[PDB]
Design a protein around this ligand. Structure first.
Ligand code: HEM
Ligand SMILES: CC1(C)C[C@H]2C=C(C(=O)O)[C@@H]3COC(=O)[C@]4(CO4)[C@]23C1
Length: 397
């Protein structure tokens, strides 16, 4: 008897930690220690999907004496209107009601066109440079920050100002740096709101300013803008890096995709499903039970913390035959859980798929000899950041 402790070691740079796959094999739910509170760890696809749809399991903490949290985690919960369990139902319903129409079919069709041209231009610059090149800096980072600049209606050069702010805000290792970075986000967004009140354009803050005859306050509008800025590029950057690493690991699938770019949608779904980095702490969706819930033979009690392992669930052989294998030819694959599920299902997931599809439609056709210029083991996943990620990806081509 040895209580398992998160985070689990992973000897590889990607995939699921062996200890978590071991727990998965034993059963759907296990009590584990963490750096803070003990929690229930749920690792099988069916149970994770069921619990993500269970409205008794919520982001907000119901407990009278809540355990202490890093500044980074406190910011992420507040951005999601999860910081007050008594007001979360109304505030989170309004949050989703105000953001979902900012990603209409009209907007997404226009953005798809611009995204496709931008990837062509980014890859032309890459192809014309001398290796070794940092693919993370010149491709993975540039496309999703371009998109956020477009959503917010600001010049592209603004991303050189805000491009590290998601990482800084979400640095769980340094509360002072996290708080000081978030204040920069706030000041920037409040400036932007003031500008859009007199100079609106076809962008998100302009739309919120006009919403319900201007009933929203500037603080409310800026809060929603902060969520778009801080959730809207960093995780996409990380999926471009992981997608590239996975395709480089699987030359037969890479060659299938280079030959037929019509396989890119299917490849993007496999990338999201298999794309887990390092110890994979960002592939856990955290919750608290607001009422008792039975999982298998286990009672989760009101107030218990629960870690929903969407990463492990996406590797579950029960839901994906040969769950550890990258396979472009899967017939009717189950919907993976990389965007979550249920009440907090990722609001940007259709836009994120458009970005990833546009990249992997083109990447290995435009750079057929692309490959890492360093050993994989030299690539360092950044465990202290809520969003993880690699800091550089050196390639040759
Ligand atoms: C591949 C890229 C992305 C991944 C893997 C991802 C993943 C996720 C996940 C797992 C959640 C659920 C969190 C939870 O249940 O507690 C979520 C929520 C969210 N995502 Fe995404 N995301 C991505 C891109 C984006 C983009 C591009 C945007 C906007 C531009 C965005 C906006 C949001 C927002 C606002 C929420 C909060 C939804 C809510 O609390 O109701 N995300 N995302
Ligand atoms: C709002 C989020 C940025 C979306 C989710 C995806 C993430 C990721 O891919 O890194 C974040 C990791 O930390 C979490 O708690 C998550 C899993 O819910 C995320 C919060």
């Amino acid at each position: 008897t040895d209580l398992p402790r998160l985070p689990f070691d992973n000897p590889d740079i990607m995939g699921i930690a062996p200890q978590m796959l071991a727990l998965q094999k034993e059963g759907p739910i296990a009590r584990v220690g963490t750096a803070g509170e003990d929690a229930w760890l749920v690792t099988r696809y069916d149970e994770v999907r069921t619990l993500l749809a269970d409205r008794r399991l919520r982001l907000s903490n119901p407990n009278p004496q809540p355990s202490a949290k890093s500044a980074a985690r406190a910011f992420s919960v507040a951005l999601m209107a999860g910081d007050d369990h008594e007001t979360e139902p109304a505030r989170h319903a309004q949050m989703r009601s105000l953001l979902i129409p900012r990603f209409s079919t009209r907007r997404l069709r226009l953005m798809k066109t611009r995204i496709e041209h931008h990837v062509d231009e980014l890859l032309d610059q890459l192809a014309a440079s001398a290796p070794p090149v940092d693919l993370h800096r010149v491709l993975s980072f540039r496309l999703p920050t371009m998109v956020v600049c477009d959503l917010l209606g600001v010049p592209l050069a603004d991303r050189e100002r805000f491009g590290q702010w998601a990482r800084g805000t979400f640095d769980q290792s340094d509360n002072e740096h996290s708080a000081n970075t978030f204040q920069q986000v706030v000041d920037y967004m409040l400036e932007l709101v003031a500008r859009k009140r007199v100079e609106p354009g076809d962008d998100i803050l302009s739309e919120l300013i006009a919403e319900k005859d201007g009933a929203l306050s500037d603080a409310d509008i800026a809060h929603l803008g902060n969520a778009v800025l801080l959730f809207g590029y960093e995780t996409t950057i990380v999926r471009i890096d992981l997608g590239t690493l996975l395709l480089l690991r699987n030359p037969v699938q890479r060659a299938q995709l280079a030959e037929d770019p019509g396989l890119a949608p299917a490849a993007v779904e496999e990338i999201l499903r298999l794309g887990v980095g390092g110890k994979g702490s960002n592939a856990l969706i955290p919750r608290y039970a607001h009422g008792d819930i039975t999982v298998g033979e286990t009672v989760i009690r009101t107030g218990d913390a629960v870690m929903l392992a969407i990463g492990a669930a996406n590797y579950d052989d029960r839901a994906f035959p040969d769950g550890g294998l990258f396979d472009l030819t899967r017939v009717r694959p189950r919907s993976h859980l990389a965007f979550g599920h249920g009440a907090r299902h990722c609001i940007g997931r259709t836009l994120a798929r458009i970005e990833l599809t546009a990249v992997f439609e083109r990447l290995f056709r435009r750079l057929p000899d692309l490959r890492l210029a360093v050993p994989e083991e030299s690539l360092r996943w950044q465990e202290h950041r809520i969003t993880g990620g690699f800091d550089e990806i050196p390639v040759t081509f």
